[PDB]
Write an enzyme that holds these catalytic residues in place. Sequence first.
Site, short mmCIF file in Angstrom:
data_model
loop_
_atom_site.label_atom_id
_atom_site.label_comp_id
_atom_site.label_asym_id
_atom_site.label_seq_id
_atom_site.Cartn_x
_atom_site.Cartn_y
_atom_site.Cartn_z
N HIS A 1 45.26 43.41 30.05
CA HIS A 1 45.47 43.35 31.49
C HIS A 1 46.78 42.68 31.87
O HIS A 1 47.17 42.73 33.04
CB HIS A 1 44.30 42.62 32.17
CG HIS A 1 44.28 41.14 31.93
ND1 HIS A 1 43.48 40.55 30.97
CD2 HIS A 1 44.93 40.12 32.55
CE1 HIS A 1 43.65 39.24 31.00
NE2 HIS A 1 44.53 38.96 31.95
N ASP B 1 40.22 44.21 25.76
CA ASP B 1 41.31 43.63 26.55
C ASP B 1 42.38 43.04 25.62
O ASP B 1 42.89 41.94 25.85
CB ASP B 1 40.79 42.56 27.52
CG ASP B 1 41.81 42.19 28.57
OD1 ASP B 1 42.74 42.99 28.81
OD2 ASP B 1 41.68 41.10 29.17
N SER C 1 46.09 33.55 29.73
CA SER C 1 45.54 34.63 28.92
C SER C 1 46.52 34.98 27.80
O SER C 1 47.74 34.87 27.96
CB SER C 1 45.25 35.86 29.78
OG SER C 1 46.45 36.47 30.22
N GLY D 1 47.50 32.46 34.08
CA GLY D 1 48.71 32.65 33.30
C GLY D 1 48.63 32.19 31.87
O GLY D 1 49.66 32.14 31.19
C1 LIG Z 1 37.33 36.01 38.14
C2 LIG Z 1 38.39 35.93 37.00
C3 LIG Z 1 38.45 34.48 36.45
C4 LIG Z 1 39.79 36.31 37.56
C5 LIG Z 1 38.01 36.93 35.87
N1 LIG Z 1 36.77 36.49 35.27
C6 LIG Z 1 35.93 37.46 34.55
O1 LIG Z 1 36.10 38.62 34.69
O2 LIG Z 1 34.91 36.96 33.69
C7 LIG Z 1 34.02 37.93 33.19
C8 LIG Z 1 32.72 37.25 32.90
C9 LIG Z 1 32.93 36.61 31.54
C10 LIG Z 1 34.04 37.41 30.84
C11 LIG Z 1 34.52 38.48 31.86
O3 LIG Z 1 33.98 39.72 31.60
C12 LIG Z 1 34.76 40.81 32.11
C13 LIG Z 1 36.06 40.95 31.27
C14 LIG Z 1 37.26 40.87 31.87
C15 LIG Z 1 38.56 40.98 31.04
F1 LIG Z 1 39.21 39.78 31.05
F2 LIG Z 1 38.26 41.32 29.75
C16 LIG Z 1 39.50 42.05 31.64
N2 LIG Z 1 39.74 43.26 30.91
C17 LIG Z 1 40.67 44.31 31.49
C18 LIG Z 1 40.90 45.52 30.77
C19 LIG Z 1 41.76 46.49 31.30
C20 LIG Z 1 42.39 46.27 32.55
C21 LIG Z 1 42.17 45.08 33.26
C22 LIG Z 1 41.30 44.10 32.72
N3 LIG Z 1 41.05 42.81 33.50
C23 LIG Z 1 40.17 41.81 32.96
O4 LIG Z 1 39.90 40.57 33.64
C24 LIG Z 1 40.78 40.29 34.73
C25 LIG Z 1 41.94 39.45 34.31
C26 LIG Z 1 41.21 38.27 33.78
C27 LIG Z 1 41.93 36.94 33.82
O5 LIG Z 1 42.23 36.45 34.85
N4 LIG Z 1 42.20 36.24 32.54
C28 LIG Z 1 42.87 34.92 32.57
C29 LIG Z 1 44.37 34.82 32.94
O6 LIG Z 1 44.95 33.79 32.98
N5 LIG Z 1 45.08 36.06 33.24
S1 LIG Z 1 46.74 35.99 33.65
O7 LIG Z 1 47.52 35.41 32.56
O8 LIG Z 1 46.98 35.04 34.74
C30 LIG Z 1 47.31 37.66 34.08
C31 LIG Z 1 46.54 38.48 35.13
C32 LIG Z 1 48.83 37.89 34.02
C33 LIG Z 1 47.92 38.46 32.92
C34 LIG Z 1 42.36 33.92 31.52
C35 LIG Z 1 41.94 33.78 33.00
C36 LIG Z 1 42.54 32.56 33.72
F3 LIG Z 1 42.86 32.89 35.01
F4 LIG Z 1 41.61 31.55 33.73
N6 LIG Z 1 40.05 38.12 34.74
C37 LIG Z 1 40.05 39.35 35.63
C38 LIG Z 1 39.12 36.96 34.81
O9 LIG Z 1 39.25 36.05 34.05
#
Ligand SMILES: CC(C)(C)[C@@H]1NC(=O)O[C@@H]2CCC[C@H]2OC/C=C/C(F)(F)c2nc3ccccc3nc2O[C@@H]2C[C@@H](C(=O)N[C@]3(C(=O)NS(=O)(=O)C4(C)CC4)C[C@H]3C(F)F)N(C2)C1=O
Length: 201
Positions: free
Chosen positions: A78, A102, A160, A158
């Site tokens: 993502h 992911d 991930s 940010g």
């Molecule tokens: C509500 C919430 C916290 C935003 C959300 N919770 C949540 O969904 O939890 C459920 C329940 C327990 C596990 C999860 O099961 C679903 C799996 C989600 C996934 F992760 F596998 C994912 N697969 C994708 C595949 C293809 C396309 C898009 C995808 N989008 C995904 O998820 C999305 C993104 C992910 C995210 O924000 N990750 C982090 C991050 O920092 N990103 S980032 O660097 O800033 C950035 C966006 C620049 C890259 C670490 C968490 C930090 F912020 F703490 N999400 C939403 C969440 O964490």
Amino acid sequence: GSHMASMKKKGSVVIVGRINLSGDTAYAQQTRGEEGCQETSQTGRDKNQVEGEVQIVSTATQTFLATSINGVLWTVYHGAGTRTIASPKGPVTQMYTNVDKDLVGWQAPQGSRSLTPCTCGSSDLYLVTRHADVIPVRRRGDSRGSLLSPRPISYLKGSSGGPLLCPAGHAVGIFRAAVCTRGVAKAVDFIPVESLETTMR
Ligand SMILES: CC(C)(C)[C@@H]1NC(=O)O[C@@H]2CCC[C@H]2OC/C=C/C(F)(F)c2nc3ccccc3nc2O[C@@H]2C[C@@H](C(=O)N[C@]3(C(=O)NS(=O)(=O)C4(C)CC4)C[C@H]3C(F)F)N(C2)C1=O
Ligand SMILES: [Cl-]
Ligand SMILES: [Zn+2]
């Protein structure tokens, strides 16, 4: 139809810094500024020296982390999508791509140090953020870990693609998502290192 001649092309993922974990203190270093980042994203040519295990990476729209394990630089789908990563010889195509997990991965850049998979099965885990925070995490499942102290989801945004590490600094997983209840993060979800080793076999 489509006007193909004007069809844009997405840029490459660019390394813009690292989380230094070689000394006794954990701190983030930036190795490239915004201007240089954008040109490097479009060129795919990054001549900067790479060091360490945990890289800070950015597209034109997002910034997150990437971690080197067993010769592969891993991050989240993502954040990176299917994009190339910039390198000294040009854009490098993904070696691994799994949207179900992911997860994506590139050839680890020259000069990077890979983390070794954890083999201790310890419940005491530690999450490395983009700000060089080392957050204790109590492992609760195959891909879950509980935060000893709940935080605003902002602090983890940010991070991930960053690592969850053992007490010995061995790689346990790749930070993927957070268990959020109305704005607060109580636990984290991560790609297990054993799932990485499954994808690699
Ligand atoms: C509500 C919430 C916290 C935003 C959300 N919770 C949540 O969904 O939890 C459920 C329940 C327990 C596990 C999860 O099961 C679903 C799996 C989600 C996934 F992760 F596998 C994912 N697969 C994708 C595949 C293809 C396309 C898009 C995808 N989008 C995904 O998820 C999305 C993104 C992910 C995210 O924000 N990750 C982090 C991050 O920092 N990103 S980032 O660097 O800033 C950035 C966006 C620049 C890259 C670490 C968490 C930090 F912020 F703490 N999400 C939403 C969440 O964490
Ligand atoms: Cl997985
Ligand atoms: Zn360990």
